[PDB]
Amino acid sequence: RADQLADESLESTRRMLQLVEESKDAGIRTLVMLDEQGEQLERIEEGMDQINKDMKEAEKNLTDL
Amino acid sequence: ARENEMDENLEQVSGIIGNLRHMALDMGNEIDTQNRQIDRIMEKADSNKTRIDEANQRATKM
Amino acid sequence: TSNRRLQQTQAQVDEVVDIMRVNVDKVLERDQKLSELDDRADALQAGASQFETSAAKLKRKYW
Amino acid sequence: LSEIETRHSEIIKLENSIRELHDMFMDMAMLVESQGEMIDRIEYNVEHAVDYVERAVSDTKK
Amino acid sequence: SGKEAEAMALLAEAERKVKNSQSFFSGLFGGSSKIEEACEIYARAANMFKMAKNWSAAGSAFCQAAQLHLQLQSKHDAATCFVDAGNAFKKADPQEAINCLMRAIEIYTDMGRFTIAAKHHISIAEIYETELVDIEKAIAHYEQSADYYKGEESNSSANKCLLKVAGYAAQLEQYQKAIDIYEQVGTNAMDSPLLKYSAKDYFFKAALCHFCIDMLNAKLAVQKYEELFPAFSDSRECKLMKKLLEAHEEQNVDSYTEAVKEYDSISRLDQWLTTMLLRIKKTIQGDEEDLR
Amino acid sequence: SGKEAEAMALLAEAERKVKNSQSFFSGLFGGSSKIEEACEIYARAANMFKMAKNWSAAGSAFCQAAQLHLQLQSKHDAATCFVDAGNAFKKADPQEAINCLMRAIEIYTDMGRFTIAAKHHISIAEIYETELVDIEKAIAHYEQSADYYKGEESNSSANKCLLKVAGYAAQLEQYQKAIDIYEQVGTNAMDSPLLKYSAKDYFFKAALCHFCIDMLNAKLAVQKYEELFPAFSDSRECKLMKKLLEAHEEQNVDSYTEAVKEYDSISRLDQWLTTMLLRIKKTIQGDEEDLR
Amino acid sequence: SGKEAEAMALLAEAERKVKNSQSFFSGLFGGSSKIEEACEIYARAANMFKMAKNWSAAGSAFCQAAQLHLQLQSKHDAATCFVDAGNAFKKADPQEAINCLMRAIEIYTDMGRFTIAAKHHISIAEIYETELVDIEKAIAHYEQSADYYKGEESNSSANKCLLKVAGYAAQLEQYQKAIDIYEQVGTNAMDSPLLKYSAKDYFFKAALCHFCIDMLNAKLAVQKYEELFPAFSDSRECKLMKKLLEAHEEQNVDSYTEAVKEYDSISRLDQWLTTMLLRIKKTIQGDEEDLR
Amino acid sequence: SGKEAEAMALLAEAERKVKNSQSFFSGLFGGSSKIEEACEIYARAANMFKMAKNWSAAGSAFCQAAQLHLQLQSKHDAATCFVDAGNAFKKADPQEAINCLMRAIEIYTDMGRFTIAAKHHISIAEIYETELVDIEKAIAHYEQSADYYKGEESNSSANKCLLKVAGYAAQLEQYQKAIDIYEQVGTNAMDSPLLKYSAKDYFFKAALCHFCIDMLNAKLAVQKYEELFPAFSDSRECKLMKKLLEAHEEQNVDSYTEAVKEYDSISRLDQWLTTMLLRIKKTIQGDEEDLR
């Protein structure tokens, strides 16, 4: 039982890091993926502006219409 | 060699969690910047719809 | 190396869950913020595609 | 006996803790990519409507 | 709410747009429209009910406003306010919610956007899960919606739809359908760096779907076929749960609850996975009465 | 700042838009407007103060510019610069901040967008928490804002609003209100794969709200009702903290600090949870003086 | 599907736009166009096939509709429906998919947007990886696409493209090319707080690329150069795997599988990293036959 | 690159827009403009260099195109192509990069958007950190940019700017400035549920900034002031590192490296934190030579 507990603890502590080295690569995957969405979110902010300003002048030119 | 590797794993496990919190802490911050960053896009894409919707009838009746 | 240095990690993983107990809330809200921004920024196209089209229809008596 | 039966039955509480932690990242790393395609279908969708107004802004001032 | 039901819905929101000059007139103008004036004054009219939280009378004014652009034959300008009734009637009569959203779909079909349509095919299916509980109707909405996501290349977001059509089909005894979805998800999950550690969750559901009345005897033929590609899904103990469950399937049926006692402790199972094991636990007692 | 207060606010930003030709003229033109010219030259005028960091004089020029579009009766074009005064007066007189944002809301109400309105109902409530400390006024703004999010289907982002209206109502002795919010959050939290492991945090606050003067004796009736649905929230020791606290409620009142000594060490409690236990710790000494 | 192939593709979608009045006429009008009428009726025509899931006949109608705006010389209005054929022919003949997307690129080139172009240079490369398996053609598409991302400042999203052009070049024996990409990624990864703990994954691939036939003897000269900047990448055991592999490179070649037995257990290696070690394992047996 | 430098930059991109009919003509037209024609043909001209990767000749054509709209006095159309030169000259002469971006700022100042301006005040500061290494000039750009973010309510994204202006000021011996930023960040960090566990990382830098030549003797007065609000930042051992460092400051100076030997192992310190301890390690040897 005592020796067995130690043995049990071996396959405990083996899968313990194998659960938590495993938590690390998903932790680093989100950080690559979240920062990659930042420049996805950057293009929309810049785009929305030009998405608004160039578009915006046309509203000023409505008096011609 | 048995209680050694229990330490030698929980030495290197605590060498992960001191990094694993670290990397999860920026993830708790990187989203917060983006939540503000979508929020600038949010009301502006709400305005840009409303401006054009004013301008559609100003190009429909025109 | 013993019970005490385990209870460093035992309290430390308790912080990581908490920290992430905040983090699942922030990553959820932006989900529904974009999924509604889908309908805004695609009605923006059909608002703008209908617009020009009516300004392709407004080019009369140009000569 | 009792010097590790007290200890190892508390180690199982640590692995029961990380199993709660592990399923939360994989749901999160699912959910970011599950959002990572909604952020694509905005991106080129904006790149559509930029040009429809860019085609509009040259024509409207005429 | 908000100064007496927002002026008692603005005193029926400017006398229910009446005195619209018949809402039809061909004497003076032949090339003008007061119908376009009737758009905003009657779309604002629907908006005042949501301040007064009268959702039942809200969407009733959206639909005729949506009929108004359909009367003016502007397509997209009608569609975005059908959904404003469909968003309105969710906290109201849901049968009026689902068909108004259904009327909103066919405008988006021939518009050029299926993403918006697939978003509402799961929105109509949200109503079938919560209020008007009719599961097999929701199956055809999810199965239709996943066809749109696959048509628009979003293979990641297709699965979040396509899991639930396999999820609800499991307790509806449509296994051989649903056993292919979990297979085609998991085969298309192991090949990516994303979803790779999520993939072992699917095959455990997939092998669980091999328990119709059949192939629990050929569970070995299941798991050797599950051995085949993903290297035992790097041999997670979730599949080792099934491995001891194989020899369990013959004798010692009391160890079934013992097998999950060492699994529900380490991972709290949900109400889906509880019932699927419990329906196996009913069928495994047929082996108990055979032993007598 | 930036070349002498940005040219001393551009020398009062082009002589305060005076010589606008009376800003009203009906002799030459009957179908034109110099008011539209007065928009940009006076919206740029407000912008120059933010370069000089004179926020008090900034929003004073936004509001008349916001009045200018209201004078031109263009609705949306006024609303987006009321908020530019409301963003301006936050680092200024906050009573002028809140009502200008309040004037910005009613334009967005009958516009068709409550998302923008609910964003500012919590922005006005941000001012009530920080500078003009009036908590129960902020309660009605959060409670109004959550009604908009539920009206626009965002059940996830409604809660982040709806927690704080239950959060501040707790120390304002409005428990039986707030005890329903934590219940309706947590009942609507256990049903989802998201928020499931967050749900145990809510019911611990919910059971904590059962300590008005009453139902600490019926704490057993609380926790058996909390046993009922979520399987003890898979039996977190945070609820086991309450379980030993039940038998604590009769005798041995010194063990209250001992019960949190083994809990604040494992999880550093915040200033909200500190006071809620401490107000129980006051009431539990009423059981101490009863024992005498 | 959907009422008999959507009315058998709407009975060939209104008689294949025939009776377009020759689709060319200069008698009555010299300043009008029925071609603009032929746009929507023939773009809707392509849309009806996707309801009937006839993707092969779908994009055949997009391309002439894309030719139609090219006939009307409106540039952008043609480009967004070439890609609707390019999205169509992916579940069809892929050689027709890639060149129609290739024809869509040159409109976006002289338009002012390379982001859209770089998105399709990896979309065309997605087809080269899955269906028309031609790896070195996909290399030139990724290498071209990363030039667009670097031209548009997105240094983060350039790498996700630029890894795969280094990834596929590794098994194509183009190491000295690919050994510079992993170096220039990792040198530009250590300098940022984001991607710092990811950077050790790259240099392990980079040192792995020093195994052409050469510089496994100068592996010490590799790793001392890898010592140089990033402080052993804070000395991860993934580099310590290479450190024991250095003295392994001379003798005891059976310990190669032993060295990864203690590494595949702690971290399940993928099929890329498996083959790269296995091709070293072939070359290390040349040291075994030298020992004889 | 791309068919011989993109037709050798399109054979100087259509003869350098010459034969523009003098680019000025008042004979025929008095109310027309060929300058507007000269916009796109010369903005496309700058675009062809980025295909040929000639960034030095690229932005030289953007700036006159940006001068073009300034010649046409059109707001919002010159500014977005100054930055296209500013993005161009980053892989070129950086002194031409920074001032063209600087010329782009003043258009965005009186436009109504400081978010765009604060994004480029850190973009110009990115150049000062990497190529034209002049740190104290970058200090005034970050300090100006954080004033814009605080003016536009983004208190979260202000800090990511405002840390670096405190970060670079630390090694520039501007502590008493930078000691207030880390204090005002951390005081405004403990009050939020976000950034709360990040806040202990700031005060450790803040107490580290109390080592000018002074207040290492009053380090106790530092840390008791750091005791005061955030409850020892729930007593992280990172502050306990400073606690044993207090009694270290008198004697046993060899234990300084011993104190970080038990800290660099548990947490790999960066090159910022290395030098700040090392400059203390120089000053602590002044206590060693006092002991002699």
Q: How far is G276 from chain A (nearest CA, A)?
A: 20
Say which residue the tokens 């997939």 belong to: E206
Do E154 and D36 make contact, defined as CB atoms within 8 angstroms? Answer: no
Distance in angstroms (rounded) separating the CA atoms of residues H159 and H181? 9
How buried is E289 (Cβ within 10 angstroms: 0-12 exposed, 13-18 middle, 19+ buried)? exposed
Residues from C contacting D (CB-CB < 8 Å) are: 3, 6, 9-10, 13-14, 16-17, 20, 23-24, 27-28, 30-31, 34-35, 37-38, 41-42, 44-45, 48-49, 51-52, 55-56, 59
Q: How far is CA F98 from the centre of its chain?
A: 13
Closest residue by Cα to residue C54 from B54, E37, B56, E110: B56
Task: State which H helix or E strand residue F215 sits in.
Answer: none
Chain F hits for E91, Cβ within 8 Å: 150-151
F198 and chain H in contact, CB less than 8 A: no
Q: How far is D60 from chain A (nearest CA, A)?
A: 6
Closest residue by Cα to residue G200 from G192, G210, G189: G189
* Amino acid residing at B58: R
Give chain C's radius of gyration (CA, Å): 27
Instruction: Give me the total of CB pairs closer than 8 Å, taking one residue from chain B and one from chain E.
Output: 4
Closest residue by Cα to residue F128 from F87, F98, F163: F98
Distance in angstroms (rounded) separating the CA atoms of residues G6 and G45? 11
Architecture of C1-63 per CATH? Up-down Bundle (1.20)
Distance in angstroms (rounded) separating the CA atoms of residues G105 and G113? 10
Distance in angstroms (rounded) separating the CA atoms of residues E288 and H274? 70
D4 and chain C in contact, CB less than 8 A: no
User: What letter would DSSP give residue F193?
Assistant: S
**What percent of chain C is helix, strand and coil (3-state, nearest 5)?**
85, 0, 15
Give the neighbours of chain F: at least 3 Cβ pairs within 8 Å.
B, C, D, E, H
What is the residue extent of each domain of chain A? 1-65
In a 13 Å sphere around the CA of E89, the CA atoms on its Cβ side amount to 25
Three-class DSSP category at F27? coil
- Among E75, E108, E119, the strongest candidate for a mutation testing the C interface, having the largest count of C CBs within 10 A, is E119
Q: How far is H108 from chain F (nearest CA, A)?
A: 11
Q: How far is CA G234 from the centre of its chain?
A: 32
Q: How far is D8 from chain E (nearest CA, A)?
A: 15
Q: How far is C49 from chain H (nearest CA, A)?
A: 22
Give the neighbours of chain G: at least 3 Cβ pairs within 8 Å.
A, B, D, E, H
- The residue of chain C with its CA nearest to that of D55 is C52
G195 and chain A in contact, CB less than 8 A: yes
Backbone angles phi, psi at G118, to 5 degrees: -70, -25
Given a contact cutoff of 8 angstroms between Cβ atoms, the answer to whether E89 and E56 are in contact is yes
The CA–CA distances, whole Å, from E177 to C20, E139, E165 equal: 37, 12, 10
Do H43 and G112 make contact, defined as CB atoms within 8 angstroms? Answer: yes
Backbone angles phi, psi at E207, to 5 degrees: -65, -30
CA angle H150, H156, H157 (to 5 degrees): 75
Name the token pair of H194. 């976000």
Distance in angstroms (rounded) separating the CA atoms of residues H185 and H158? 10
Chain B hits for H194, Cβ within 8 Å: 28-29, 32
Q: How many structural domains compose chain B?
A: 1
Given a contact cutoff of 8 angstroms between Cβ atoms, the answer to whether B41 and D49 are in contact is no
Distance in angstroms (rounded) separating the CA atoms of residues E266 and F243? 22
Residue B60 sits in a domain of what CATH number? 1.20.5.110
- Among B12, B51, B57, the strongest candidate for a mutation testing the A interface, having the largest count of A CBs within 10 A, is B51
End-to-end CA distance of chain H: 68
Task: State which H helix or E strand residue A23 sits in.
Answer: helix A22-50
How buried is F112 (Cβ within 10 angstroms: 0-12 exposed, 13-18 middle, 19+ buried)? buried
Task: State which H helix or E strand residue B24 sits in.
Answer: helix B3-60
Distance in angstroms (rounded) separating the CA atoms of residues F134 and F131? 9
Chain A hits for D47, Cβ within 8 Å: 47
Chain D hits for C31, Cβ within 8 Å: 31, 34-35, 38
Distance in angstroms (rounded) separating the CA atoms of residues A37 and G194? 13
Say which residue the tokens 């523009």 belong to: H20
DSSP codes of every residue in chain G = --HHHHHHHHHHHHHHT--SGGG---SS-SS--STTHHHHHHHHHHHHHHHTT-HHHHHHHHHHHHHHHHHTT-HHHHHHHHHHHHTTGGGS-HHHHHHHHHHHHHHHHTTT-SHHHHHHHHHHHHHHHHTS--HHHHHHHHHHHHHHHHHTT-HHHHHHHHHHHHHHHHHTT-HHHHHHHHHHHHHTTTTSSTTSSSHHHHHHHHHHTT-SSSSSTTHHHHHHHHHHTTGGGGT-HHHHHHHHHHHHTTS-TTHHHHHHHHHHTTS---HHHHHHHHHHHHHHHHHHHHH-
Closest residue by Cα to residue G72 from G115, G113, G43: G43
Given a contact cutoff of 8 angstroms between Cβ atoms, the answer to whether D14 and E133 are in contact is no
Distance in angstroms (rounded) separating the CA atoms of residues H67 and E75? 43
C22 and chain H in contact, CB less than 8 A: yes
Q: How far is C57 from chain H (nearest CA, A)?
A: 23
Backbone angles phi, psi at G33, to 5 degrees: -150, 120
G27 and chain B in contact, CB less than 8 A: no
Resolution in A: 3.9
Residues 6+ away with beta carbon under 8 Å from E242: E204, E207, E219, E223
Closest residue by Cα to residue G126 from G145, G111, G151: G145
Do D16 and E160 make contact, defined as CB atoms within 8 angstroms? Answer: no
The CA–CA distances, whole Å, from F113 to B54, E41, F149, F151 equal: 15, 16, 11, 11
Alpha carbon dihedral H241, H244, H248, H252, in 10-degree steps, equals -100
Distance in angstroms (rounded) separating the CA atoms of residues E48 and F258? 56
Distance in angstroms (rounded) separating the CA atoms of residues E278 and E291? 20
Residues 252-271 of chain E whose Cβ lies under 8 A from any Cβ of chain A:
none
What is the residue extent of each domain of chain D? 2-60
Alpha carbon dihedral F104, F110, F112, F114, in 10-degree steps, equals 50
Q: How far is F292 from chain B (nearest CA, A)?
A: 49
Say which residue the tokens 């009036």 belong to: F134
Residues 6+ away with beta carbon under 8 Å from F219: F207, F210, F242, F245, F246, F249
F9 and chain H in contact, CB less than 8 A: no
Do E48 and F110 make contact, defined as CB atoms within 8 angstroms? Answer: yes
Name the token pair of G173. 């024996």
Backbone angles phi, psi at A62, to 5 degrees: -65, -25
The CA–CA distances, whole Å, from E73 to C49, E26, E36, G179 equal: 16, 18, 11, 61
Chain B hits for E36, Cβ within 8 Å: 57, 60-61
User: What letter would DSSP give residue F211?
Assistant: -
Distance in angstroms (rounded) separating the CA atoms of residues A34 and A43? 15
Distance in angstroms (rounded) separating the CA atoms of residues F109 and E215? 60
Chain D hits for A30, Cβ within 8 Å: 25, 28-29, 32
Indicate the angle between helix axes E155-171 and D2-36, nearest 10 degrees. 120
Distance in angstroms (rounded) separating the CA atoms of residues G201 and E138? 45
Do A56 and H76 make contact, defined as CB atoms within 8 angstroms? Answer: yes
Name the token pair of H28. 């025929």
Given a contact cutoff of 8 angstroms between Cβ atoms, the answer to whether H48 and H6 are in contact is yes
User: What letter would DSSP give residue F198?
Assistant: T
Distance in angstroms (rounded) separating the CA atoms of residues H138 and H119? 14
Q: How far is CA G8 from the centre of its chain?
A: 37
What is the residue extent of each domain of chain C? 1-63
Do B10 and C58 make contact, defined as CB atoms within 8 angstroms? Answer: no
D51 and chain F in contact, CB less than 8 A: no
* Amino acid residing at E119: K
DSSP codes of every residue in F50-107 = HHTT-HHHHHHHHHHHHHHHHHTT-HHHHHHHHHHHHTTGGGS-HHHHHHHHHHHHHH
Given a contact cutoff of 8 angstroms between Cβ atoms, the answer to whether H210 and H182 are in contact is no
Backbone angles phi, psi at G214, to 5 degrees: -110, 165
Distance in angstroms (rounded) separating the CA atoms of residues G184 and G181? 5
Q: How far is E193 from chain A (nearest CA, A)?
A: 9
Given a contact cutoff of 8 angstroms between Cβ atoms, the answer to whether B25 and A27 are in contact is no
Q: How far is B50 from chain A (nearest CA, A)?
A: 11
